Amino acid sequence: MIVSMIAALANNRVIGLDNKMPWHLPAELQLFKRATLGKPIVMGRNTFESIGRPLPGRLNIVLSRQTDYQPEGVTVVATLEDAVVAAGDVEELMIIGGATIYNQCLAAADRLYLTHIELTTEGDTWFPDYEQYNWQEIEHESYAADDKNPHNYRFSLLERV
Ligand SMILES: NC(=O)C1=CN([C@@H]2O[C@H](COP(=O)(O)OP(=O)(O)OC[C@H]3O[C@@H](n4cnc5c(N)ncnc54)[C@H](OP(=O)(O)O)[C@@H]3O)[C@@H](O)[C@H]2O)C=CC1
Numbered sequence: 001m002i003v004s005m006i007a008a009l010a011n012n013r014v015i016g017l018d019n020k021m022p023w024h025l026p027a028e029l030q031l032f033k034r035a036t037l038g039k040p041i042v043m044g045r046n047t048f049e050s051i052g053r054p055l056p057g058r059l060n061i062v063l064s065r066q067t068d069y070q071p072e073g074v075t076v077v078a079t080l081e082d083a084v085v086a087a088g089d090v091e092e093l094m095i096i097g098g099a100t101i102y103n104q105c106l107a108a109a110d111r112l113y114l115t116h117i118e119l120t121t122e123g124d125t126w127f128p129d130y131e132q133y134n135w136q137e138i139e140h141e142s143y144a145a146d147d148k149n150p151h152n153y154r155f156s157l158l159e160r161v
C-alpha cells in the first residue's frame, strides 16, 4: 500500500483559516476528486466537519479520540494504526488532511499530491515542511486562472526519495 497525502497549499504552505480554506477555487475540488475517487481517504475530525458530509466513491475514515463520535457513513478510528487497518490491502491510501494528520503522517508518506495556488493569504493551519526531505516529481499539471477560478494553480505529484 502506497501512503499518499493530498493537499492544496497557498504561499508559505497555508492550507486553512477558521476551519475552511481561505480561497474561492471550485475547479481545485475537481482535481481533488479525480485524485481520490476509488481510494480510501483518511482525515482528522476537523477536516471531516469542514467537508460536512461523507464523500461518495471513497471509504471515508475519520480520526477521533472522542468515543461517542460517530457520524453516519464514515468509519471512525481512534489511532493511525487503526486507520491503516480499515484501509485494508489497497493500492494506495490518501491522507486528505488536516494539519495535525499531515504532521503525523509525513515521515511515512510515499507520495505527496500537492496543488500550489499562487496566492498570499493569512492562515491558521499550515502544511508541514516537506522540503526537509528529498522528493522527485513524477506528475504535474498547470491551470491558469479563468472566469470561474481567480488564481493560477498547479499540480505536482512528488515521490519520496
Ligand atoms: N488546503 C487543504 O488542502 C486542506 C485544508 N484543510 C484545512 O485544515 C484545517 C483542519 O486541520 P486541523 O485543525 O489540523 O484538524 P484535523 O482535520 O487534522 O483534525 C484534528 C482532529 O483529529 C483528531 N486526531 C488528530 N490526530 C489523531 C490521532 N492520532 N488519533 C485520533 N484522533 C486524532 C482530533 O480530534 P478529537 O479531538 O475528536 O480527538 C483532532 O483534534 C481546516 O482549516 C481545513 O479547512 C483540511 C484539509 C485539506
Ligand SMILES: CN(Cc1cnc2nc(N)nc(N)c2n1)c1ccc(C(=O)N[C@@H](CCC(=O)O)C(=O)O)cc1
Residues within 6 Å of the ligand: 006, 007, 008, 021, 028, 029, 030, 031, 032, 033, 050, 051, 055, 056, 095, 096, 097, 114, 115
Ligand atoms: C474542505 N474540503 C477538503 C479539501 C478540499 N480541497 C482539497 N484539495 C486538495 N488538493 N487536497 C485536499 N486534501 C483537499 N481537501 C472539501 C470540501 C468539499 C469537497 C467536495 O464536495 N468534493 C467533491 C467534488 C466537488 C463537489 O462535489 O462540489 C468530491 O467528490 O470530491 C471535498 C473536499
